Amino acid sequence: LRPFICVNEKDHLPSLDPQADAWYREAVALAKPDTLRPWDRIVDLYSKAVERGHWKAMHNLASLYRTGWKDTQKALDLYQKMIDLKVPQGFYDMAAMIGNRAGVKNPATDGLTFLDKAASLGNPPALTELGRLYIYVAGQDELGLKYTNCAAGQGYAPANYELAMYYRLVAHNYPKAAGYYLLAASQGNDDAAFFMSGVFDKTSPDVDRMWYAPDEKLHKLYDGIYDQLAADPDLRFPNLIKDHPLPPHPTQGYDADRPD
Ligand SMILES: [Au+]
Ligand SMILES: [Au+]
Numbered sequence: 001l002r003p004f005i006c007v008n009e010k011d012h013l014p015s016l017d018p019q020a021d022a023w024y025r026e027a028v029a030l031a032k033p034d035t036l037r038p039w040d041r042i043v044d045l046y047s048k049a050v051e052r053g054h055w056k057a058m059h060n061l062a063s064l065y066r067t068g069w070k071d072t073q074k075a076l077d078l079y080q081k082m083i084d085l086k087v088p089q090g091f092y093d094m095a096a097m098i099g100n101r102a103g104v105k106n107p108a109t110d111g112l113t114f115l116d117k118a119a120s121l122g123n124p125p126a127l128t129e130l131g132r133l134y135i136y137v138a139g140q141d142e143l144g145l146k147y148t149n150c151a152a153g154q155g156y157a158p159a160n161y162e163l164a165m166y167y168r169l170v171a172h173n174y175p176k177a178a179g180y181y182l183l184a185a186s187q188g189n190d191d192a193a194f195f196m197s198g199v200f201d202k203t204s205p206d207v208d209r210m211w212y213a214p215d216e217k218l219h220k221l222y223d224g225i226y227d228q229l230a231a232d233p234d235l236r237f238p239n240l241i242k243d244h245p246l247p248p249h250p251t252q253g254y255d256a257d258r259p260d
């Protein structure tokens, strides 16, 4: 991807067939892991949707084949169908399965690795993974941050978790980092909610708190958020940030670059 150009994945997706999407949505509802799942019906619905070109159904069904409830080749075939439709997620899935470097051998990538192709089409998982490699392995912080923010901007929670970790561990901008942890947690990110559950705990060491002062109310709040989310990954917390603004940081205020 040179030069790096950030695009929105939505501008590179096939339209979804209405009947197909009805079938997909019904299968998704039936397949919720915290319910007693009717596997035959779920596979049937996904399969009907796949026959009418639904790429999200291809993705979910391929996952089911990868784990069983196992058919490696059926999963691979589905990923290839997605790639055939130039679905960005398809390139990501193929990378995540057989490896990134094999992408150069696939004609649909045009001599790009699978992740590079996916990221070129705006895929937030690929953007997040490559951004991570640029920051921590290549030492190209600014470029990796551009990748990561391109994914975060599309509402991708794990990318907000990566930004939080960067600003906490590398930049040491704790209010910024906390803003990103809270954003990821609100969007359902388990890692982020877990970290936030320790930040205002008086029994946490200073570094776990990012040197915030302990706060009983906020500890109970974020401990509760994490409790809920840990049991049910589908929860979101759309009001969390605005209903409970962050206290000022004892030395960094509301931005380490502008302590005042
Ligand atoms: Au496209
Ligand atoms: Au998935």
Ligand SMILES: [Au+]
Pocket: 169, 170, 171, 172
């Ligand atoms: Au540092």
Ligand SMILES: [Au+]
Pocket: 216, 217, 219, 220
């Ligand atoms: Au507490």
Ligand SMILES: [Au+]
Pocket: 239, 240, 243, 244
């Ligand atoms: Au609240």
Ligand SMILES: [Au+]
Pocket: 217, 218, 221, 243, 244, 245
């Ligand atoms: Au509050």
